[PDB]
């Protein structure tokens, strides 16, 4: 009937951050939540994850949260809250790492995690149908189009290319690991 | 025949900053050149002025430098290099002060200085024709349209409203002072 606690808390956290970005301004929030951009911020551990909470426009937040609501909700319903938490932390940390390596620390959004969820849900359904999870055919198409659009720069927004490839890789790797018996 | 040394050095400085912003990224340059955004940066005196050197798009830099080249060049030719320097420093410092007061430190561009130059050149020509400077009629129109467009948000870009009103005020005040005998 409805989104579980992890699915919901991420959505609420993203909205709360988005409101703060409108009231305070984007830069001021980025100072607090971006991947560490100076050696003095290296132990502010939250920053390795909170880049995923920031969004820069209406279309940016809407489409990230629409995919998260669907895929995160499915993961949480079929595999449980803890599974969603771990996929979220791994994809956020690793996608941030690769993005910062390619292009520095000034990036944000939930799409490293989303692309991990796309790969994860699709591959786990293919390799481990008895899990009870899968990516419905029609959504495979739209997930594929979303991948193509990120990769070929079709969104009309500068792309976190490193985050995208690293997230999708993570999600596939986790599905692989999880499908072994 | 050509732009004097102050007119030129400002143009070159803006291009050099603009190149750095494309190679390094905008945020990284803003960290170095923006109005002080943390109490630890309060004695980095250059920041009270270098906000004027940053531009965020092709149209942003092109139209700021086109007006500067014309008006700055006129000031420098008719009133000398030192006069241009002082109008530039006063307008940059005061326009930054007002902008940061209204909206915080995340702003840039040469348009506080440009709007000061518009006011200055027009008013000095009106009040002190024997100076040898004036704003030609047709350019009064276009300067006026530029003022209206800044004030009513017609550029399709978020406006530094405080910088604009403070710059124009500065330029008018200086012309007033300079026209007294």
């Amino acid at each position: 009937e409805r989104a579980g606690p992890v699915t919901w808390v991420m959505m609420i956290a993203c909205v709360v951050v988005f409101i703060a970005m409108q009231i305070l301004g984007d830069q001021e929030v980025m100072l607090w939540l971006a991947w560490p951009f100076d050696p003095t911020l290296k132990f502010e551990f939250w920053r390795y994850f909170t880049h995923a909470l920031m969004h820069f426009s209406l279309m940016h937040i809407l489409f990230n949260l629409l995919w998260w609501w669907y895929l995160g909700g499915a993961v949480e319903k079929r595999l449980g809250s803890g599974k969603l938490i771990v996929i979220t932390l791994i994809s956020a940390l690793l996608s941030g790492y690769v993005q910062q390596k390619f292009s520095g620390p000034w990036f944000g959004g939930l799409s490293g995690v989303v692309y991990a969820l796309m790969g994860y849900v699709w591959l786990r359904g293919e390799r481990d149908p008895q899990s009870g999870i899968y990516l419905q055919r029609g959504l495979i198409i739209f997930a594929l189009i979303w991948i193509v659009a990120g990769w070929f720069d079709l969104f009309g927004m500068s792309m976190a290319n490193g985050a995208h490839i690293a997230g999708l890789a993570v999600g596939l790797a986790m599905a692989f690991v999880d499908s072994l018996n | 025949e050509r732009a004097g040394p102050v007119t030129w050095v400002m143009m070159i400085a803006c291009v050099v900053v603009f190149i750095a912003m494309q190679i390094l990224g905008d945020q990284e340059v803003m960290l170095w050149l923006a109005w002080p955004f943390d109490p630890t940066l309060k004695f980095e005196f250059w920041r009270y002025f270098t906000h004027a050197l940053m531009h965020f798009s092709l149209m942003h830099i092109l139209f700021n430098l086109l007006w500067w080249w014309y008006l700055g060049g006129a000031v420098e030719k008719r009133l000398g290099s030192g006069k241009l320097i002082v109008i530039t420093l006063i307008s940059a410092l005061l326009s930054g002060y007002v902008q940061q007061k209204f909206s915080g430190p995340w702003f840039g561009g040469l348009s506080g200085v440009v709007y000061a130059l518009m006011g200055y050149v027009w008013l000095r020509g009106e009040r002190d024709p024997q100076s040898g400077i004036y704003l030609q009629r047709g350019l009064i129109i276009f300067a006026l349209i530029w003022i209206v467009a800044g004030w009513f948000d017609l550029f399709g870009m978020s406006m530094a409203n405080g910088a604009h009103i403070a710059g124009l005020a500065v330029g008018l005040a200086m012309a007033f002072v300079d026209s007294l005998n």
Binding site: F56, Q99, W106, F107, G108, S158 | -
Partner: peptide, 4 residues
């Protein structure tokens, strides 16, 4: 400015 930022990557999305």
């Amino acid at each position: 400015r930022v990557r999305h």
